[PDB]
Design a binder for this molecule. Structure first.
Ligand SMILES: N[C@@H](CCC(=O)O)C(=O)O
Length: 277
């Protein structure tokens, strides 16, 4: 039975499960402009919600969706503003000190989005340039460290969410947008002129996405991991990948045209929660 102070206990006592979600993490957790929060990662959230309803024997359990940001996700998680979220949050050692993560659901490389006809081809070209990044992300940490350690004299602009960062680039307020490659492609898919943007540069890091939940809650993590494991090992995860990464997706019916890496296929065979950092 759920111990006091655990998430399942909180949900049962409050009579509702609070699902944190993203507004601009395409195509993981975002608004489809059809009144729904959708995406590859959100699909796991829905599966986890179903598992919770079953586990607690509450078929009519309330489900409340609350938007979160890269910057406020941990503080909101810690005071229980939301119970868990599946989106584009990187699982790393530092964050494990403040939260817990489910088995890995995606892997990304941190790169740059910039104009095709522009002069930015790699990270070295960013010296003395204006670069935008989303507040509270691993890319912001990496970019600031690179700026300091390599004395790049970059003017770093920190935006509230990925769409804001992209629009900063699109409107000429920055020459490049540094972020997880999948997210860069996601913002490009919503651009006024998608073809005008290229993802370039050597990845500054390889990062694993995991649904995030509160730390020291083994029972809720188990429920989430068990749900993820069945989705991945059954072949359902790949079907979700194809839907969100190989077919037209909202809100502009564009295609990500991504391919599932052999590494991801290996993980789907045997799910695990190892932080890549
Ligand atoms: N995955 C990175 C950037 C993307 C995001 O935060 O939504 C992070 O967790 O910081």
């Amino acid at each position: 039975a759920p111990a006091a102070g655990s998430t399942l206990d909180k949900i049962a006592k409050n009579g509702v499960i609070v699902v944190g979600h993203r507004e601009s993490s395409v195509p993981f957790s975002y608004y489809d402009n059809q009144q729904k929060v959708v995406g590859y990662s959100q699909d796991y959230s829905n599966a986890i919600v179903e598992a919770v309803k079953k586990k607690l024997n509450k078929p009519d359990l309330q489900v409340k969706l609350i938007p979160i940001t890269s910057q406020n996700r941990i503080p909101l998680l810690q005071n229980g503003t939301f119970d868990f979220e599946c989106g584009s949050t990187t699982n790393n050692v530092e964050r494990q000190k403040q939260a817990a993560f489910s088995d890995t659901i995606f892997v990304v490389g941190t790169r740059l989005l910039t104009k095709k006809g522009g002069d930015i081809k790699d990270f070295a070209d960013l010296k003395g340039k204006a670069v935008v990044v989303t507040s509270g992300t691993t890319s912001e940490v990496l970019l600031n460290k690179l700026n300091e350690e390599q004395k790049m004299n970059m003017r770093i602009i920190s935006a509230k969410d990925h769409g804001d960062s992209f629009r900063t680039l699109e409107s000429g307020r920055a020459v490049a947008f540094m972020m997880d490659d999948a997210l860069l492609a996601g913002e490009r898919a919503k651009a006024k002129k998608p073809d005008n943007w290229d993802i370039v540069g050597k990845p500054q890091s390889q990062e694993a996405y995991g649904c995030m939940l509160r730390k020291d809650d083994p029972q809720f993590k188990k429920l989430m991991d068990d749900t993820i494991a069945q989705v991945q090992t059954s072949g359902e995860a790949e079907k979700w990948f194809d839907k969100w990464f190989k077919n037209p997706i909202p809100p502009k019916n564009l295609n990500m045209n991504f391919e599932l890496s052999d590494e991801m296929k290996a993980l789907f065979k045997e799910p695990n929660d190892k932080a890549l950092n």
